[PDB]
């Protein structure tokens, strides 16, 4: 299985000039290192997959994501950036390696973290898929976006356990945390 992890505003945009299109939410990034970093199995790690933009939008004092194994995919890059664990050219790459002895036993959970490349190809993943999205209930000037999500496919929870319902806000901007899980 895997899950993939987003935050989007309400004209489903994700990024702007390499960066958010809104001003940091702290409070968005801790539920965000919630859900990617817990694992119930003991000892273990969970795996964040992102692209290469992604890696090098995360300021340097968070990298790595602390207490995650952290992959990036780049096809130009010939070793991890400085800090990061594994280099993959594909996803599916990065989930074969995932099945390889050196990672096997290391890692729990997988969690696809951006940008729109990748969850593009996570959303064709044959086996099961949960999105958890963050909706920035407020339109961003933005320059990569989330694709749609076809609710003839994906069901939205009216809950997830561990998962706030009610309705955030920082900043003076209101979001709110939402789960969709593939139909069988
Ligand atoms: N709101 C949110 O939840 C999130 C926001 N962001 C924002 O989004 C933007 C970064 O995302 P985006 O611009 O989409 O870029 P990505 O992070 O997807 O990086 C794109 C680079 O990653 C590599 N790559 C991406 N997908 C694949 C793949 N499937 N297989 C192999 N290589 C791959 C390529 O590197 P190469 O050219 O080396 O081959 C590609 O040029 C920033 O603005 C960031 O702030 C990012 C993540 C989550
Ligand atoms: C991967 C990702 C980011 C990537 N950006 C940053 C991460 C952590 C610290 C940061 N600190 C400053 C600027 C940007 C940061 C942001 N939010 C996200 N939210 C949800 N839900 N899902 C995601 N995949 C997110």
């Known amino acids: 299985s895997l899950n993939c ?15 958010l299109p809104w001003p940091p939410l702290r409070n968005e990034f801790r539920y965000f290192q919630r859900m ?15 692209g290469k933009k992604t890696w090098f939008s ?18 130009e890059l010939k070793e991890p950036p400085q800090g990061a ?17 050196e990672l096997a036993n290391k890692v729990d959970m997988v969690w696809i973290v951006g940008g729109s490349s990748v969850y593009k190809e996570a959303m064709n993943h044959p086996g099961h898929l949960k999105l958890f999205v963050t909706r920035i209930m ?17 069901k939205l929870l ?5 998962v706030l319902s009610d309705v955030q806000e920082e900043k003076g901007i209101k979001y709110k945390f939402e789960v969709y899980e593939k139909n069988d």
Request: hydrophobic share 30%.
């Open 5 to 19: 992890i987003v935050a989007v505003s309400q004209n489903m945009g994700i990024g702007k000039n390499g960066d």
């Open 36 to 50: 990617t970093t817990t694992s119930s199995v003991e000892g273990k790690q969970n795996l964040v997959i992102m």
């Open 58 to 75: 995360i300021p340097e004092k968070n990298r790595p994501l602390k207490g995650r194994i952290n992959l990036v995919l780049s096809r």
């Open 85 to 101: 664990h594994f280099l993959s050219r594909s996803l599916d790459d990065a989930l074969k390696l995932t099945e390889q002895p």
């Open 138 to 154: 407020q339109d961003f000037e933005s320059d990569t976006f989330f694709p749609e999500i076809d609710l003839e496919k994906y």
């Open 158 to 162: 009216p809950e997830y356990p561990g």
